[PDB]
């Protein structure tokens, strides 16, 4: 104001168009919807190339004017608009880049997640070998991603540092990325645990079913390898007993192998209930492998949950430990021991070991008694064959000892015969009579000496 009226018009119209352009490019809303960002890039490109062309329309106008301030004021407004126009074209660019990148980076993690989410960890999946390696490949792919992600955030923080008009909105998008990333690592942490427990689960039954087959087929093997009849020669017996004692040593090495299975069973996890079709009368107890949270509903690593519905092989309806029903991803839930299928097997296998141990005890004392029987008969023949004339040739302690031998060999027999199945009462009397006879046949010759 205060100038020529033609100058007040030409200058007003200019400042009016130059500021109506600022209004339009400030009334743009900042969003991460790539479809919007795209139309804003084209939109502004039309406004930028418009004011860029306006420099010449402005030159013509400054040439007609003569008012000192007017000219300066117009040039100052234009140079200000032009500067803002450039910085806008750049702010849009920077945005599109950072979002496109983060957008594709989220889909990558999501796809990784979708994969592990749909994986089958039941007993039907025995390939803890394929999985083990495929996983190590991914853990490498991931250590690779963390790099790409780290510098993607370093690119983002820079934009916030430069007060990008959309700072808050991109930090929010990055928040999303961070959330997905943290979750994929949680899955990997509990995938390492499935791999371990599932390995054990299969290792255990492979070893147990193989031990059970052994101790059951050994209960019959032995009984055939060591027959016990009353008509076996003395030599053969002593040699059988020696082998029979090597056997016990071996079945003591089993006790240690067996005791190991007893222990493992107490730690073997449950897999069958992971299948939607598995039915049981006892409720299924779960444990959380990692924190999972979905809007105000949160489960903590180590929380005990109850399974309600598992028709979905990726999402289970789960309750507890605060009576709170919630859908938590199957991946992050395991079914801890005790596994009744494992404990019962370890109990069974243990009873086979004990059966063998008992069988051994029977065969042992059986032979030990058959040996005392023979040792007794040798002494009985010595005493029976004793004549008064034959005695005088021998020392007075050669025969005094032969009865001592018999007395002791007969005690050993009575002792081993107690729990033996080799001698019925018919024989326990038969020998009892041979002994008592020979006993007096001796004291008949003990009195005749003087």
Residue at which a domain ends, from 336, 351, 373: 336
Radius of gyration of the chain (CA): 48
Q: What are 316's strand-pairing partners?
A: 328
Distances (CA, A) of 369 to 235, 346, 402, 411: 14, 35, 20, 11
Residue at which a domain ends, from 225, 250, 279: 225
Distances (CA, A) of 347 to 18, 78, 264, 341: 91, 91, 12, 10
CATH of the domain at 279: 2.30.30.40
Secondary structure (H, E, C), the chain:
CCCCHHHHHHHHHHHHHHHHHHHHCCCCCCCCCHHHHHHHHHHHHHHHHHHHHHHHHHHHHHHHCCCHHHHHHHHHHHHHHHHHHHHHHHHHHHHHHHHHHHHHHHHHHHHHHHHHHCCCCCCCCCCCCHHHHHHHHHHHHHHHHHHHHHHHHHHHHHHHHCCCCCHHHHHHHHHHHHHHHHHHHHHHHHHHHHHHHHHHHHHHHHHHHHHHHHHHHHHHHHHHHCCCCCCCCHHHHHHHHHHHHHHHHHHHHHHHHHHHHHHHHCCCCCCHHHCCCCCCCCCCEEEECCCEEECCEEECCCCEEEEEECCCCCEEEEECCCCCCEEEEHHHEECCCCCHHHHHHHHHHHHHHHHHHHHHHHHHHHHHHHHHHHHHHHHHHHHHCCCHHHHCCCCCCCHHHHHHHHHHHHHHHHHHHCCCCCCCHHHHHHHHHHHHHHHHHHHHHHHCCC
Query: Could you tell me the residue range of the domain that residue 408 belongs to?
Result: 226-267+337-449
CB-CB contact of 342 with 263 (8 Å): no
CB-CB contact of 44 with 78 (8 Å): no
- Tell which phi-psi region holds residue 301, choosing left (phi > 0), alpha (psi between -120 and 50) or beta: beta
d(CA 410, CA 431): 9
Q: What would the two tokens of residue 342 be? A: 């494992």
Residues 391 and 246 in one domain: yes
Q: What are 318's strand-pairing partners?
A: 307, 326
For this PDB entry, the determination method is X-ray
Residues 244 and 277 in one domain: no
CATH of the domain at 171: 1.20.58.60
CB-CB contact of 128 with 195 (8 Å): yes
Residues 292 and 189 in one domain: no
Longest alpha-carbon distance in the chain: 175
The angle subtended at Cα 297 by Cα 294 and Cα 300, nearest 5°, is: 95
Residues 141 and 16 in one domain: yes
Residues 211 and 242 in one domain: no
CA proximity to 380, closest of 448, 319, 296, 437: 437
Residues 352 and 287 in one domain: no
Q: Which residues, 6 or more positions from 112, have their beta carbon under 8 angstroms from its beta carbon?
A: 138, 142, 184
Distances (CA, A) of 273 to 58, 139, 270: 79, 28, 7
Distances (CA, A) of 103 to 157, 162, 176: 17, 22, 10
Residues 207 and 298 in one domain: no
d(CA 208, CA 265): 10
CA proximity to 145, closest of 172, 105, 115, 187: 105
Q: Which residues, 6 or more positions from 284, have their beta carbon under 8 angstroms from its beta carbon?
A: 270, 273, 306, 307, 335
CATH of the domain at 425: 1.20.58.1060
d(CA 393, CA 389): 8
Q: 155: how many CB neighbours lie within 10 A of its CB?
A: 14
d(CA 136, CA 32): 35
Q: 109: how many CB neighbours lie within 10 A of its CB?
A: 20
Residue at which a domain ends, from 298, 319, 336: 336
Residues 148 and 18 in one domain: yes
Residues 198 and 136 in one domain: yes
Count of domains in the chain?
A: 3
Q: In what order do the strands lie in the sheet containing 304-309? A: 326-329, 315-319, 304-309, 285-288, 333-334
Distances (CA, A) of 87 to 14, 72, 282, 308, 420: 22, 23, 67, 57, 105
Residues 217 and 234 in one domain: no
Experimental resolution (Å): 3.0
> CB-hemisphere CA count at 13 Å for 23?
6
Residues 236 and 117 in one domain: no
d(CA 417, CA 411): 10
Residues 208 and 83 in one domain: yes
d(CA 60, CA 57): 5
């Amino acid at each position: 104001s205060g100038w020529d009226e033609f100058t007040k018009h030409v200058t007003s119209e200019c400042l009016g168009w130059m500021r109506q352009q600022r209004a339009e490019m400030d009334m743009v809303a900042w969003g991460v919807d790539l479809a919007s960002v795209e139309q804003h890039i084209n939109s502004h490109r039309g406004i930028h190339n418009s004011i860029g062309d306006y420099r010449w329309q402005l030159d013509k106008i400054k040439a007609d004017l003569r008012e000192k301030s007017a000219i300066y004021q117009l040039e100052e407004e234009y140079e200000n608009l032009l500067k803002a126009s450039f910085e806008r074209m750049d702010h849009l660019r920077q945005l599109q880049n950072i979002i496109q990148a983060t957008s594709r980076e989220i889909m990558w993690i999501n796809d990784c997640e979708e994969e592990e989410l749909l994986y089958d960890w039941s007993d039907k999946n025995t390939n803890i070998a394929q999985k083990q390696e495929a996983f190590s490949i991914r853990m490498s792919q991931l250590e690779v991603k963390e790099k790409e992600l780290n510098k993607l955030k370093q690119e983002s923080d820079q934009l916030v540092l430069n007060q990008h008009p959309a700072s808050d909105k991109i930090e929010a998008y990055m928040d999303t990325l961070q959330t997905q990333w943290s979750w994929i690592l949680q899955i990997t942490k509990c995938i390492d645990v499935h791999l371990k427990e599932n390995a054990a689960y299969f290792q255990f039954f492979e070893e147990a079913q193989s031990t059970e087959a052994y101790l059951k087929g050994l209960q019959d093997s032995i009984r055939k390898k060591y027959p016990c009849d009353k008509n076996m020669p003395l030599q053969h017996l002593l040699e059988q007993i020696k082998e029979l004692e090597k056997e016990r040593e071996k079945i003591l090495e089993y006790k240690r192998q067996v005791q190991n299975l007893v222990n493992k069973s107490k730690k073997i996890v449950q897999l069958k209930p992971r299948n939607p079709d598995y039915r049981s009368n006892k409720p299924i107890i779960l444990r959380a492998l990692c924190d999972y949270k979905q809007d105000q509903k949160i489960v903590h690593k180590g929380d005990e949950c109850i399974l309600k519905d598992n028709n979905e092989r990726s999402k289970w309806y789960v309750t507890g430990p605060g009576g709170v029903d919630m859908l938590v991803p199957s991946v992050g839930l395991i079914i801890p021991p005790p596994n009744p299928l494992a404990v019962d097997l370890s109990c069974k296998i243990e009873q086979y070991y004990e059966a063998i141990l008992a069988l051994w005890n029977q065969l042992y004392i059986n032979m030990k008694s058959l040996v005392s029987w023979h040792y007794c008969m040798i002494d009985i023949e010595k005493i029976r064959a004793m004549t008064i004339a034959k005695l005088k040739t021998m020392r007075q302690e050669d025969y005094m000892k032969t009865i001592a031998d018999l007395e002791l060999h007969y005690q050993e027999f009575i002792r081993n015969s107690q729990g033996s199945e080799m001698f019925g009462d018919d024989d326990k009397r038969k020998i009892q009579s041979q002994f008592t006879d020979a006993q007096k046949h001796y004291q008949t010759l003990v009195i005749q000496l003087p």
